[PDB]
């Protein structure tokens, strides 16, 4: 454990590197669901 | 630190497992925002 504790210790300090808010999104984009009934009745 | 260094060393080797580009997306899908004005004026 000279070889073991020493060894065990990180075998042969994890440092998370993280990432990013992958979700971009844009749904809103005046979803056609507004002017689809403009003048349903002409 | 026989118990301490040995101990300290990873107490009792972090290996990140990562994930995936969760964002699937499809927005484009000919967003109705193209043929919503086909013949607004009949």
From Swiss-Prot, chains A, B:
| Localization | Cell envelope; Cell outer membrane
Phenotype when the gene is knocked out: Deletion causes substantial alterations in cell envelope structure, and a significant defect in resistance to solvent and shear stresses. Mutants shed exterior layers of the cellular envelope. Deletion mutants show a significant decrease of the UV resistance, especially under desiccation conditions. Deletions mutants show large disruptions in the OM, but the S-layer is unchanged compared to wild-type cells.
Superkingdom in the source lineage: Bacteria
> What's the record's remark on domains?
The structure is characterized by a pore region with a massive beta-barrel organization which is embedded in the outer membrane and shows some protrusions into the S-layer, a stalk region consisting of a trimeric coiled coil, and a collar region at the base of the stalk.
Biological function: Plays an important role in the structural organization and integrity of the cell envelope, bridging the outer membrane to the peptidoglyan layer. Is a highly abundant molecule in the D.radiodurans cell envelope but is not a fundamental component of the S-layer. Binds the carotenoid deinoxanthin, a strong protective antioxidant specific of this bacterium, and could be part of the first lane of defense against UV radiation, especially under desiccation. Appears to be a nonselective channel.
Q: What is annotated about its quaternary structure and interactions?
A: Homotrimer. Part of a heterooligomeric complex resulting in the main assembly named S-layer deinoxanthin-binding complex (SDBC) which is composed of six different subunits, namely SlpA, DR_2310, DR_0505, DR_A0283, DR_A0282, and DR_A0281.
Q: What else is known?
A: D.radiodurans possesses an atypical cell envelope comprising an inner membrane, a large periplasmic space with a thick peptidoglycan (PG) layer, and an outer membrane (OM) covered by a surface layer (S-layer).
Its protein name is Outer membrane protein SlpA
Query: Which taxonomic lineage does the organism of this UniProt entry have?
Result: Bacteria, Thermotogati, Deinococcota, Deinococci, Deinococcales
